Amino acid sequence: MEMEKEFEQIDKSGSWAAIYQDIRHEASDFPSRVAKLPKNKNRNRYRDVSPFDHSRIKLHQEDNDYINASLIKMEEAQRSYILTQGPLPNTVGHFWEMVWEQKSRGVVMLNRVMEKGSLKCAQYWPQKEEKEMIFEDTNLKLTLISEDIKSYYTVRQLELENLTTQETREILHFHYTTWPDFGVPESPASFLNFLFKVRESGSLSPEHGPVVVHCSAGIGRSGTFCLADTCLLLMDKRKDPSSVDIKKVLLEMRKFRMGLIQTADQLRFSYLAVIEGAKFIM
Ligand SMILES: CS(=O)(=O)NCc1ccc(Cl)cc1
Ligand SMILES: CS(=O)(=O)NCc1ccc(Cl)cc1
C-alpha cells in the first residue's frame, strides 16, 4: 500500500499489535557468540540485547575487542549508523575509543542519564569547561568547549584528544532531552526538528565515519531515529516516493541489530514521523 492510508487503515482497525508481532516473527536471527563470552558480562547493560557477530564494531585493542555496538549499513540510501547501548561505568573509555577509531563527527543521545528514578547511562561527558575527563584505560582526554541549551534538545561542542599521538578532533553531541519517561511523544514535530539539526551539522554525511546513536539499550528510540532518517532519504531519491515500505526498511535494518523498535507505539510513532516529515521536505 501507500503509508498514510495504510496508517489510517491500521488505526481504524486497531491492529498495531498484530502488525508489530508479524515484524518480530519475520526478523533475522544470527549468532551473538562474542557478546555471550563470560569475560564480557560487565560490558553488556541487558542480557537480552547483544550485537550480532557479523556486524559488531571491533575495538582496535588485542586483549579484548568487544563493545555492545553494531554497524547498520543501508546500501540503497547510502547511509551508515553505529547503534550502541548507553555506556556503563566500566565502558566509558571503550565508547570514546570507538568514536576515535571509527572517525565519527557526531554522537546522538536520545535518553536522560536518570529516567524513572534509575540510572539509564553513565555521565560520560564533562559538564564544565574547566573540569575535563581523562580515560586512563583508553588514553583519551575529553573537554567541553561550548553548550547550547534549547527547549527540546542541547548541542555540545567537545574536543577529543588521543594522548598517544596528541591528535585532536571536534565531536558534536546532539542530546534530545524531552522523550517522555513512559510511551512516545504525542507529536513528531520536535523529534523531526532535531533530526534536521543533526543532518545540517554534516554528522550523517559520507565525508565522516558513521554517526554514533544511543539510548539506554540502543534498539528502541535509537531504532526510531535511523528508521525515520533512511525512509525520508529514500523518498527523496526514488521516482515514486509512495514505493517506500517502512516495514521492509525496518526488517533490512534488523539484519544488522536485533530488536530495533521495541513496542507497537514506537512503530506507530515511526510511521507518524515519516508521514509528517515527507510534507515538510517539499
Ligand atoms: C543465536 S543463534 O545464532 O544461535 N541462532 C540463529 C539461527 C537462525 C537460523 C538457524 Cl537455521 C539457526 C540459527
Ligand atoms: C587501545 S587503547 O589505547 O585505546 N586502550 C586500551 C584498551 C582498550 C580496550 C580494552 Cl577492552 C582494554 C584496553
Side-chain angles (χ1 to χ4, degrees):
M1 210 171 311
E2 183 240 56
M3 195 164 28
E4 175 139 38
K5 287 182 287 152
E6 194 198 347
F7 181 83
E8 319 228 66
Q9 192 253 314
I10 296 161
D11 256 8
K12 78 173 158 48
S13 53
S15 43
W16 285 109
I19 301 304
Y20 180 65
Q21 266 305 141
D22 294 345
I23 289 158
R24 290 188 62 162
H25 180 73
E26 285 300 321
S28 302
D29 210 12
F30 296 115
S32 51
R33 287 168 215 126
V34 182
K36 302 311 291 181
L37 296 169
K39 69 175 168 163
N40 291 325
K41 187 162 194 165
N42 80 342
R43 294 179 175 218
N44 299 307
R45 179 174 295 281
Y46 305 101
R47 60 149 181 68
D48 58 333
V49 180
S50 299
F52 298 139
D53 295 321
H54 78 86
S55 56
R56 72 188 184 94
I57 304 292
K58 297 179 190 181
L59 299 169
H60 298 191
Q61 198 265 16
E62 78 289 81
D63 192 41
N64 187 347
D65 71 8
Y66 178 75
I67 182 170
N68 194 316
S70 308
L71 182 63
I72 301 7
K73 193 171 181 194
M74 303 300 294
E75 182 178 10
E76 188 187 353
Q78 283 294 288
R79 272 279 216 254
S80 293
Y81 316 88
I82 292 165
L83 268 65
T84 192
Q85 70 186 8
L88 286 158
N90 288 299
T91 72
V92 169
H94 306 148
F95 178 88
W96 285 118
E97 183 196 354
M98 173 173 70
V99 169
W100 184 270
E101 282 166 4
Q102 304 299 319
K103 301 180 151 58
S104 313
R105 166 68 166 153
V107 172
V108 173
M109 173 169 182
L110 303 171
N111 65 292
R112 293 167 303 280
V113 162
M114 179 166 278
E115 297 181 6
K116 293 180 182 183
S118 298
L119 293 176
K120 294 298 165 188
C121 100
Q123 182 61 51
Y124 65 85
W125 74 90
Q127 286 180 292
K128 289 182 194 295
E129 289 86 340
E130 64 275 19
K131 294 277 203 192
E132 75 275 15
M133 289 179 73
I134 295 180
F135 305 103
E136 297 221 339
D137 71 324
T138 55
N139 213 222
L140 293 154
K141 183 176 100 172
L142 183 63
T143 311
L144 177 70
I145 299 302
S146 72
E147 176 164 69
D148 191 346
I149 303 170
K150 308 279 226 307
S151 45
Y152 292 92
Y153 72 89
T154 296
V155 187
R156 310 181 179 90
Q157 302 183 299
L158 309 172
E159 180 198 71
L160 184 62
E161 181 177 350
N162 174 352
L163 289 172
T164 301
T165 68
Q166 295 191 326
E167 297 171 294
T168 67
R169 280 176 212 156
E170 183 169 295
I171 306 306
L172 301 182
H173 192 244
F174 289 94
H175 187 181
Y176 189 83
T177 54
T178 52
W179 195 292
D181 274 9
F182 291 91
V184 304
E186 183 161 292
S187 158
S190 57
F191 193 69
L192 287 165
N193 279 321
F194 174 73
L195 166 60
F196 298 156
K197 298 289 181 191
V198 180
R199 277 186 174 196
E200 286 179 8
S201 83
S203 290
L204 288 165
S205 299
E207 294 72 30
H208 300 296
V211 70
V212 173
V213 163
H214 79 86
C215 47
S216 196
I219 62 170
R221 300 172 200 177
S222 291
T224 297
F225 184 92
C226 63
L227 182 60
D229 184 50
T230 286
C231 287
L232 290 170
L233 212 46
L234 292 170
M235 287 175 82
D236 270 332
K237 207 169 217 254
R238 283 184 185 178
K239 290 180 180 194
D240 179 8
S242 76
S243 72
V244 171
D245 183 340
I246 181 169
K247 296 191 268 43
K248 284 173 181 182
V249 177
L250 175 54
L251 291 165
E252 179 67 23
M253 292 185 162
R254 277 196 180 215
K255 299 175 177 178
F256 300 94
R257 190 169 176 80
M258 61 174 65
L260 302 184
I261 312 297
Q262 284 177 290
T263 70
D265 259 38
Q266 275 175 13
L267 182 66
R268 182 180 186 276
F269 182 76
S270 303
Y271 273 74
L272 251 185
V274 173
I275 293 165
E276 294 301 305
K279 301 162 178 173
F280 197 70
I281 217 108
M282 315 175 169

